[model samples]
Target chain A: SGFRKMAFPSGKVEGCMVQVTCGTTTLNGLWLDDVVYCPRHVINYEDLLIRKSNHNFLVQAGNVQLRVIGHSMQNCVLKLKVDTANPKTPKYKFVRIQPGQTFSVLACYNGSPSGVYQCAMRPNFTIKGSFLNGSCGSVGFNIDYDCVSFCYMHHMELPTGVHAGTDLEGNFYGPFVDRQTAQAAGTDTTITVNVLAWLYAAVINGDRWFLNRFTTTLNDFNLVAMKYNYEPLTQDHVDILGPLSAQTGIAVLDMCASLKELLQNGMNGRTILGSALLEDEFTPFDVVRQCSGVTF
Target chain B: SGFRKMAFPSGKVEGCMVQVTCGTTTLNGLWLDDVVYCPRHVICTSEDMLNPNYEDLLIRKSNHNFLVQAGNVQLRVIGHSMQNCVLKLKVDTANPKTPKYKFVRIQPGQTFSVLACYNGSPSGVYQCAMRPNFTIKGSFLNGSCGSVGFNIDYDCVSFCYMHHMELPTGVHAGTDLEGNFYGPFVDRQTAQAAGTDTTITVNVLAWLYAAVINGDRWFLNRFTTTLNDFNLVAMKYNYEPLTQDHVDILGPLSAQTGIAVLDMCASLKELLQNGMNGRTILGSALLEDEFTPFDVVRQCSG
Candidate 1:
């Protein structure tokens, strides 16, 4: 058998029957006679991109065993593990999802247990017949400035504070963060400025009226909090200064007016004492309105 | 052959078969054996009752015949000798320029009938008065029938009582009638639901007075429909064919005092109808205020 050896530059090579001189990067393949062919090795990198963008993972806590079914037809394998303390027995499993197919995996279980079960996959695979590796490129979405401005038409602030984890209407509210964490110094004056930006971005794209209603609700919450001495700014103080941020200050002055009446009457003592004494007292007017079927 | 006549005492007598002593009355009739044989000659007192009360009668002019039909019944009058004449039909003998007028000429003993009978009636007793303004002679001769009131549903009593009588299109210029000086009655139920029943009656009469003066068919039609619906005793009402009165009644209001009242009724009707049709809040409020007869009078007077 005679082998034809062609000298080429040192360069990156893809298909067969190519010659290089400067730099040659050999790809894994085989050839026959005058025709040289290379094996098409494509790794599906779909689930990695999906998982990276969609951080809203499903979590099942407590003593119940969680069986997650990842939507199938995806070219990557999904792995689920129970986040728990080190023990002799730890529950973790991985399943492969095919094109338009689904795979189920059992997670951990322990009575009176707490933590999250995270599902993730590798990028070393093909998706829908295309090799979508790290070098294959990345996908990104854009947030229109118009949407951002419209979403924040009403100003919002966190008065009673909110849980750092989970989504809206989720099953459970996680425990509050440490006082130090809450008091952590940020570039902005209030912690809510940072949280508000993150919330607007996270919410609007999913549902309609999510941002608008959320702002109105948050504004109401802040007003109620100011009534209870949880907020430091007085009504006159906020009224004279106007809104803290531009382009998102609707009803800000009205909110301050309401707060002024509450402060003048010293409405904070009983409310704060009640909140400290009992769970029912801990219910802010916002939550109270919500439970009583009232809108902001 | 013998004749038996008995003198009866002067007293009230109805039917027959009764006797009275001195200062008593005895009625004549035939009884089964003791019944006296007598022929009952009771001339039905109808037109006599209807005639005397009404002084308004018919008068015929020279050289012309007239056949007037007040409803289904037609009366024909033969003219003697006549040459030239101008016949004009005036509403309530008031406005000569009314739309219900007509002119005609006929030979001696010739029969002529004008279409004054409307809706099976004479359109409210139009007298055949002859005015000579349009003629060469220009001699205004008041005919015999000039005073006679003829209408379909009206008798001589009605002719006398109902001062307002004309074709539906005729202009009612008469300012004096029953309760003419009285203001419009306010409360409908309270005024009507009383012993005399005069206040509400007067108010309604005033409104009808205004309606006749206005010559608006919409008002007349509403009135007619309301009357027919309220009372079924006049079963034949509105069943007759619509005549000139029915068709051409919608015109302007009368002049002078009649004109003012007509304007008020018309304006009130317009305001109420507009409110109902347009569904306007202010219009509805105005309609509410103008619901009573007193309101109509007060609003109009003010």
Candidate 2:
């Protein structure tokens, strides 16, 4: 399939769905969390590089019907047909999505702040099977960028203007970004070693002056795991606890020396590990490694 | 290498990582969220199926290590070892876990407990993940669900909660870590439809302490799953899962906070009387700046 059979000479290629609507609510319900969410904003996105094809589709509007299930044996759908016949101007139409499902009026808008921007994304597919290896099955995935930096790291607003760029510390935001620099552009302030290893059980379950100024890096990873319980170290293998590579190499080098120790520890570890990895925003590292190899 | 010669004899194999530990804390920062977390839990889970090895590994425990980076370029780990010449109790040993990186602790009013994966059946939470107060999200935490570690989950689930002005200034709003702020969510179909002797679970617990304006009922009920007895109390209270059509997708600004939020069980005066069952916005949806409560920044988690 050279370049997927010359870019599909009609081997079946069709995709498009971010058709949202709201000319003064004939009926509207928006809540876009990170990638997408729906009860009716209508969404669909499929590219499927030909093996005959399969990024299923069907999200008609009005009478409403959503299905979108695509690659990785996935699912998603949003359909709405409102023209409210010039009842001011209502026109939202959409059809796809498959980044894991959540229904029941879209689970109370999981962290919603108003929705829309899910633009579209493709080049995310995986198989890599095994009867333990192959009669035919291999790995496939490509990443450049899409889903508008995952709705600019979990929407609150921004898709009204467009223009983007990010990878972070300063991938700059660029051109179009209104309604408040498009939710502070590619937001991701920082502070994760799983929220600084749970502020170390929230500062030993009792003390918390904004998390006791990082208890000197959680008491230095508890005296560096008690100075490496003796012996686990070996470079590329064996390493079971010979100081397990110098106690996890200085607990990841004193957590990068407590990342400038949260700017003199008065909070801004983004006021607590940058808001603890923004509760389900910025996903898709192969769906966070397939949700971490099937739900850990 | 074609057909990969039936799985592998020496074509080679290796995969294992949710190795958690905590015999009794020499270094136990116990707090796992939906998957694995690290600074040390020594997680790794590589299978690769053969192609010159990659899911990278090295999660040692005694000498202490952390480096697991597997497939989508996976990453998770945990490790520790000790003996203290027969010191009473202490031996939490493990390594391997990569369930979308974890480290959870959400408590706006308590009830989303974690530590799942009991032989997999509808059980997950690999390395660790907890939520015991005003849920902000649920329903996805399936699949791998771990092998040996993770426990608390008699089934308390309660999802969704919001009102710090519908959420977005810096995205969420929390404090008790303490400058004083809060946020949380819920509705569970108008708390079943108000009936328990006119109880909206005691005004949805005063609309979750007025939406967190001075929260901290004894450190927010100690991150509840009913104080780790692993709970299961049905209705008279503790239920408000969400509804007035899922709190009308987050928006009401006033019908008495949308009727004590359909009588406090829908969310609260309590979202307009706990989940305002409206013909169309019955009560509106705002109160005390959307339910005030955040002094000493009491509680919140989604």
Candidate 3:
């Protein structure tokens, strides 16, 4: 019925109240442009709040760890390097693109959008949109998250500190590096890669995301924390994938490049995770056209 | 020639160079995640950018309004609202005792995690109208299609209107591309006319590769099929002598509006005329496109 107030400063209030049913009891939630409230924290902790504006946020703390991100290049990294890192101030991480390989992260999608999610190890997995509205592929795109320190009264710092990166595609896997023992020891050990081109791809039932490109091998880099999904690929998976994975090898990819030079030159084809159907292939548009609803 | 520093943050510092190709020109997209520079933003999308709609964007760029085809084969007869609605979502699934049924009022929204019936679900194939009977209002739900299906025995065997989903496995989704919905209860008026004279032509979505219905199963022969969408079933049936059983079955279905459930085999009577036995098989074929899992209104907005 009423809205709630937030922040470390205890400054302002946003959005009306919504119910979040945890078990028998219900918790209070706020619906801004998108719904922002943590079910576990709001009821359990006195501190720890999350807030967002329009489609983005500054974000959360009732004492909370929140980071906000967008398309700006420097805007993200500057937050990531912050020094006095705490819940009061947060930082953003960068989503690096290396399509050939995938590691781990609680990000947007993990090939399979609808199914039993293996977020809590091998057997116990739930579906997206079932957990939280902002969960991976749950109508919201989760981008910046790192294993290290970044964001808030934070530094644009490091006289010598640890590194951080982002999680792009999502499927729900927390503690991505249960494998790393002393990588965070940050004493003698450290690592990192080369830049590939920048990537702009689609998320599920949604819009666009920019992934920073890089080249790689999992073993060669030997970074302490990395992402991993257990379901390896096979053949029957090839067809099932055209439905789910939409993988790199044979998931009905749509690659469009212009070959138009003269006014009356090429052909446009219809189709592929997908595209549109235009009226006619008038002049020189595509070599293989995807233009439907035409006779000529 | 290799990696260089950036102000681009203009600095002449360390680390080798990487290629940043801008036409014939060279630019540095610095390796560190900080202080990034600008590049030509030429990428276009079918989203809420400076221009939101893709079709509208094309209209401005190419100078013309366009028609959008949401499905590969666009239909207008039942109209978009009708096409978008699912009459019923019946899940005769793994759970014992009773099933879950949602009246698929899919105008333009969503639902929850329902346990759906798989290809091997116990009860029946997805249907269109009630099984043609005086007993129950309908054996099927929506417009047309049902558990009882039929095929003709020509030289070898020719399939007319067997519900493909009734088989043991293979077939999964049914496409409503073909707008014609017909079957046993498919009489034009009070008088059930005849297909006894005209030799017709027909091409269907999925022909019965090999295949009836008991009250339990569709008594269908399940096997591997090489044929699919727009396959040929080159035969028709005799509609001369439709008995009183046939009279009642062929009527208007109020459940949903595409048409009525005309189960061919279920109503095809084997009659006793004199002491001599005489029988005639008269059935109508429809392009039935209602099955499980394939929902309406997916965000396939590519």
Best candidate (score: TM-score): 2
| Model number with the top lDDT | 2
* Interface RMSD of each candidate, angstroms, one decimal: 61.2, 23.4, 28.4
iRMSD (Å), candidate 3? 28.4
Q: The CA-based lDDT of model 1 is what? A: 0.19
Q: What's the TM-score of each model vs. the native?
A: 0.12, 0.21, 0.17
Cα TM-score of candidate 3: 0.17
Q: Model 1, A63: alpha-carbon shift in Å?
A: 17
Candidates 1 and 2 compared: the better one by lDDT is 2
lDDT of 2 by residue, B53-136 (tens): 111322123323332223223233333322111101112333233122222233333322122221121112211111223212
Question: Model 1 chain A — which ten-residue stretch has the worst lDDT?
Answer: A148-157
lDDT tens readout by residue for model 1, B179-261:
12112211111212111111122222233433332232333222223333322321222112222232123122223234343
What is the per-residue lDDT of model 1 for residues A49-118, given as tens digits with 9 covering 90 to 100? 3443212223222222222222211111122222332222112211222111111101101111000111
Ranking by TM-score: 2, 3, 1
Query: Model 3, B122-222: lDDT tens per residue?
Result: 11111121111101111121111211221111111111121211111111112111212232222111223212221111101111100011011122222
In the range A1-296, model 2's lDDT, one tens digit per residue, is 00000000000000111222222211122212111222211222344212312223232222343333331211222222222221212122222222111100100121111101111111111110111110100001111221111111111113322222211111122332212342422322222232333333223222244422233343444444334221111121122112321423334333323433443342332323223212121222222222223221
Clashes of each: 35, 126, 46
Stretches of model 2 off by over 4 angstroms after superposition = A1-296, B1-67, B70-137, B140-302
True contacts kept of each: 0.00, 0.01, 0.00
